[PDB]
């Protein structure tokens, strides 16, 4: 009956909790002790990108660490040359309500999506001189919150309809759907080997999915509010989540439980974006209090802040070679920091 | 100027892109953005279909003023996540059906939505144009049955005018802060043409207020 199945689920959850607690020999901070801290590291803004005329919700670096795509509420997807602050491209979007944008690892495509519940793929390299929309992936019943290219023909998109999807761009059809995630999933992060991906939702939980199998592998909890940002450790065996709870957490895939928590009592604003540095030594989080915080990932303290924005920092990203970090904000300015 | 011939032509392209961005972002500041809200089957379609998938965007014009109204009632997801995208609209057109006072209660759901959205931190200053439509069916129902059959606190007379005034007063009693924003209440029906004029007048008031805020006088 329903009560019997509920009792079985409760017993399974208790067994899972006991198994997770059994293997927690020592805390992460215990091992990362008597180790040289990063120290107060100040990073200055080298470039300021001054084209957007509305709030910026998403930016993505190119794989060459030079091109940079950014989306704004003015219905603009601008591709910048970060070295010279030159605007390489400006794409007018059909729907100005865009909450995500992605850059193809090959560099030939960009993707965007938002409150239209569509994922638009635009081709950057055509025989004509204009950027053309290549595909319109539809099938999500909620707003699109994230999207990431697997290759030139595969893209995984998370929606507010509580499910993720993997698409075939050449046919515009969902090859697989990742369901079973109560509440809107607000972020996703592809593994460096592009074999798995994690997604954090409004149930205050993160889920690890196998792209090939199409089923959830592990579920991680510990937040008491909806998760807005998630990112993968460079190794690929861990990830970090930021939530409206005004805290960040580090989970380990193999240990299958929380490793440590990055928080401070002076911070009462949620995390909009999170990202790692090369070697995964610095966790770069964006907050609603108009500033970004650089935490030492191995420890739990603050390696620094950069601030520099007059409104909420919505998006941030780190280059593939770790040269700089770009931060966008609701004040309509992108800043490259080094 | 320490630039190659190809770099100089790249800067010229960027300058042309900037010029086109300014031109596109200057005609957007001359348009009026309205956020359309309301419960299901609450006459929202009637007021959005006066003249001329997630967000449904409707663009119309009235006396040299361009209005963009974004109906977002088909999202069916967590409103707290995508509601800050509309921080900056001129007004919130909130549609409520008067006849849905006894159909768990539809009117109670409408008041819950109004309380949730009016006192939102993102819409603390934006004005609300409250349309109370299907007033003909409300009159017919009141003639058939008084409001007191479902409502208990209604100690007034079972008259159509008194019941409508009671509903309106209860609805504008739901905003905690009456100094930051002004609620415009209008009684409409299926056959009406004053809705566009009323929203235009409310937008004119908020435009004057925005100009005063720009001066710093307000």
């Amino acid at each position, epitope marked *: 009956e329903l009560d019997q199945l509920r009792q079985e689920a409760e017993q399974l959850k208790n067994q899972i909790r006991d198994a997770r607690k059994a293997c927690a020999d020592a805390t992460l901070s215990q091992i990362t002790n008597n180790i040289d801290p990063v120290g107060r590291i100040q990073m200055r803004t080298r470039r300021t990108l001054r084209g957007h005329l509305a709030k910026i919700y998403a930016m993505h670096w190119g794989t060459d660490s*030079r*091109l940079l795509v950014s989306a704004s509420q003015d219905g603009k997807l601008i591709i910048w*040359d970060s070295y*010279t602050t*030159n605007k*390489v*491209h400006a794409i007018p979007l059909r729907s100005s309500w865009v909450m995500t944008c992605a850059y193809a690892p090959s560099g030939n495509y960009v993707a965007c999506g938002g409150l239209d519940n569509i994922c638009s793929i635009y081709n950057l390299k055509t*025989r*004509e*001189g*204009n950027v053309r929309v290549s595909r319109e992936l539809a099938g999500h019943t909620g707003y699109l919150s994230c999207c990431r290219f697997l290759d030139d023909n595969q893209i995984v998109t998370s929606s507010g309809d509580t499910t993720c999807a993997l698409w075939d761009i050449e046919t515009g059809q969902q090859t697989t759907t990742f369901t079973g995630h109560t509440g809107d999933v607000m972020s996703l992060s592809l593994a460096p080997d592009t074999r798995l991906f994690v997604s954090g939702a409004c149930d205050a939980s993160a889920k690890l999915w196998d792209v090939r199998e199409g089923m959830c592998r592990q579920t991680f909890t510990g937040h008491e509010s909806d998760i807005n940002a998630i990112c993968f450790f460079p190794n690929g065996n861990a990830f970090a989540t930021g939530s409206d709870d005004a805290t960040c957490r580090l989970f380990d895939l193999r240990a299958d439980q929380e490793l440590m928590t990055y928080s401070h009592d002076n911070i009462i604003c949620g995390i909009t974006s999170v990202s790692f540095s090369k070697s995964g030594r610095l966790l770069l989080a964006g907050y609603d209090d108009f500033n970004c915080n650089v935490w030492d990932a191995l420890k739990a303290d603050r390696a620094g802040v950069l601030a520099g924005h007059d409104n909420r920092v919505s998006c941030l990203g780190v280059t593939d070679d770790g040269m700089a970090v770009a931060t966008g904000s609701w004040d309509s300015f992108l800043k490259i920091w080094n | 100027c*320490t630039l*190659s*011939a*190809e*770099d*100089k*032509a*790249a800067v*010229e*392209r960027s300058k*042309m892109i900037d010029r086109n961005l300014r031109e596109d972002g200057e005609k957007a500041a001359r348009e009026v953005k309205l956020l359309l809200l309301g419960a299901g089957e609450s006459g929202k379609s009637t007021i959005v279909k006066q003249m001329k998938t997630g967000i449904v965007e409707t663009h119309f014009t009235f006396k040299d003023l361009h209005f963009k109204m974004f109906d977002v009632g088909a999202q069916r997801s967590e409103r707290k996540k995508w509601i800050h995208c509309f921080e900056g609209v001129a007004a919130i057109i909130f549609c409520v059906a008067l006849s849905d006072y006894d159909l768990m209660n539809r009117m109670h759901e409408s008041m819950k939505l109004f309380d949730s959205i009016c006192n939102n931190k993102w819409f603390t200053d934006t004005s609300i144009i409250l349309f109370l439509n299907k007033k003909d069916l409300f009159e017919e129902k009141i003639k058939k049955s008084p409001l007191t059959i479902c409502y208990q606190e209604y100690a007034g007379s079972n008259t159509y005018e008194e019941a409508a005034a009671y509903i309106q007063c209860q609805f504008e009693d739901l905003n905690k802060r009456k100094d930051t924003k002004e609620i415009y209440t209008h009684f409409t029906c299926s056959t009406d043409t004053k809705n566009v004029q009323f929203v235009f007048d409310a937008v004119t008031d908020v435009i004057i207020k925005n100009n005063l805020k720009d001066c710093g006088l307000f």
Partner: single-chain antibody
Framework: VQLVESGGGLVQPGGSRKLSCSAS????????MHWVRQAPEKGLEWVAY????????YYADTVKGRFTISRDDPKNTLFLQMTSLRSEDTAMYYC??????????????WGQGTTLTVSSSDIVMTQATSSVPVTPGESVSISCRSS???????????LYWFLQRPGQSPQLLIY???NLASGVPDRFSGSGSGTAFTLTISRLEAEDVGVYYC?????????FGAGTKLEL
């Protein structure tokens, strides 16, 4: 993508004629446009350039003053008006589209060209080879030299390679030092450093036979090199 050049014909000395190019199949207003010249027996020679949006305009020294270049973006047409046509202006004129942003390929498409017959500081590109015979299937390497270094402070070496088949307009092969173009076979490879550059074909077919030109884009005027002919 197509560029059809119209005009030309027989012109008396000291006369004037108007050359047009009707571009179609691409976003004309976003492309800078060049007029390039080729004498009946000599190589290619750059003539004029107009940027995107009719901004900067450049002319060759040998035609400065008596030539003018304009464009009509709404009509998608490029005009070259010439006055006081001397006897040295009898040649075939090609129209070349060229877009300039990071990672673009300038001079990617060349027009068919039109013939104009009239009755009777700069960087030097030199190619010391011509009429080189080679059997198909082998590997052939040709070389080009420059007056000064084409490498710039930003790291780009602005050297372009063009192949002109017999009876056809030249087509881009390598749009910078070691930067293969789009749609060309992978056997072509550009290389070089500083002032000496090389283009190599690993296994030449019977189709890649013609005249090979090296052009510089470091600064104006854009100077070509004398052709290096390949014979089967």
């Amino acid at each position: 993508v197509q560029l059809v050049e119209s005009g030309g014909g027989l012109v008396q000395p000291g006369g004037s004629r108007k050359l047009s190019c009707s571009a179609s199949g691409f976003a004309f207003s976003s492309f800078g446009m060049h007029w390039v010249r080729q004498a009946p027996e000599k190589g290619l020679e750059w003539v004029a350039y107009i940027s995107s949006g009719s901004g900067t305009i450049y002319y060759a020294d040998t035609v400065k003053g008596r030539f003018t270049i304009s464009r009509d973006d709404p009509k998608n047409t490029l005009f070259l008006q010439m006055t006081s046509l001397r006897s040295e202006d009898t040649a075939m004129y090609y129209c070349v589209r060229s877009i300039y942003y990071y990672g673009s390929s300038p001079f990617d498409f060349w027009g068919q060209g039109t013939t104009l017959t009239v009755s009777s500081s700069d960087i030097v590109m030199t190619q010391a080879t011509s009429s080189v015979p080679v059997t198909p299937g082998e590997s052939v390497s040709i070389s080009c030299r420059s007056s000064k270094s084409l490498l710039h402070s930003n790291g780009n070496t602005y050297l372009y390679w063009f192949l002109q088949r017999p009876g056809q307009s030249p087509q881009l092969l390598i749009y910078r030092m070691s930067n293969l173009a789009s749609g060309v076979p992978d056997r072509f490879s550009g290389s070089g450093s500083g002032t000496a550059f090389t283009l190599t074909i690993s296994r030449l077919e019977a189709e890649d036979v013609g005249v090979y030109y090296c052009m510089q884009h470091l600064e104006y005027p854009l100077t070509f090199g004398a052709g290096t002919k390949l014979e089967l």
